[PDB]
């Protein structure tokens, strides 16, 4: 039998995330008669942000009230975005089902609390939580790539950012990946033994960060590169074994089912934080 089953559950990204990672647009929702694409991943995406080309405006800046505006909610009364963690807990202090949620889930629910159809609609905005200043940013624009030209990426500037869809589960800490696995190599459990991934796509990478960056670029995407049939439902090159000695990022698109002990390797995924190890 496979003793890795329970442990490896969080790396069945297709099952626990269930949507795009690089570009998450796994659901649709109607607003005033018109259908719109929507992020719907169940796991947070650590280190993911949006790079705005040509323009010098960062994407956490409020949307234009176009090149001078970002992706986030404009000022409101009362100010709902951006809102600190303590601000959110205070805002929902009378709601016992919400006030004690973890910062990422709370941020997801907070953004999902704002109904644009002012009838009930299913449209809930995605959100970014910035661990740096503990702020939740509600994203007014759900788009993630257009090549107003922009694209998603892991980046040093985005390492404390966390991209959150409306479906972020409240137990992501338990069932979703975050940290990279040090001295460990993803593998496939076969006949009572953990075997290597039989086929991988080798990309050179200077460090773990650059490997995680590459895995993200090649990961599940709900929108074809260079701009429903487009839904990945979590399928893609979501995993990577990084050999830190040979500086090889070994990227593959089948779920791992066990770990191999190897001090030359670090196990990463597209969802995982680009720095943190355990």
């Amino acid at each position: 039998g496979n003793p890795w089953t329970e442990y490896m559950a969080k790396y069945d990204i297709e099952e626990v995330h269930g949507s795009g990672i690089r570009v998450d647009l796994g659901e649709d929702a109607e607003v005033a008669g018109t259908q719109y694409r929507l992020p719907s991943g169940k796991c947070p995406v650590f280190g993911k942000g949006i790079i705005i080309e040509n323009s010098n405006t960062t994407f956490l800046k409020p949307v234009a009230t176009l090149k001078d505006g970002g992706f986030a909610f404009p000022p409101t009364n009362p100010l709902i975005s951006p809102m600190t963690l303590n601000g959110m807990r205070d805002f929902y202090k009378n709601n016992e089902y919400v006030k004690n949620l973890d910062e990422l889930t709370l941020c997801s629910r907070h953004a999902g609390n704002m109904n644009p159809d002012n009838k009930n609609s299913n449209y809930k905005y995605p959100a970014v939580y910035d661990y740096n200043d503990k702020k939740c940013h509600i994203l007014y624009i759900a788009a993630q790539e257009n090549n107003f030209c922009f694209r998603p990426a892991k980046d040093k500037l985005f390492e404390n950012y966390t991209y959150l869809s409306k479906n972020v589960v409240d137990n992501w800490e338990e069932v979703c990946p975050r940290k990279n696995l040090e001295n460990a190599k993803f593998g496939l459990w076969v006949d009572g033994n953990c075997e290597d991934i039989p086929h991988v796509n080798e990309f050179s990478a200077n460090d773990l960060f650059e490997c995680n960056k590459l895995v993200f670029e090649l990961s599940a995407s709900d929108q074809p590169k260079q701009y429903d049939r487009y839904k990945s439902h979590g399928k893609g090159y979501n995993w990577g074994n990084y050999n830190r000695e040979t500086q090889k990022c070994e990227i593959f698109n089948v779920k791992p089912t066990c770990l191999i002990n190897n001090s030359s390797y670090i196990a990463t995924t597209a969802l995982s934080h680009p720095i943190e190890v355990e």
């Binding site: 919400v98 704002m114 109904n115 159809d117 002012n118 009930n120």
Partner: peptide
């Protein structure tokens, strides 16, 4: 303007 889904419902403009 938006309307909160969770009670108590309010409007945010």
């Amino acid at each position: 303007c938006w309307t909160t889904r969770m009670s108590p419902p309010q409007q945010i403009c």
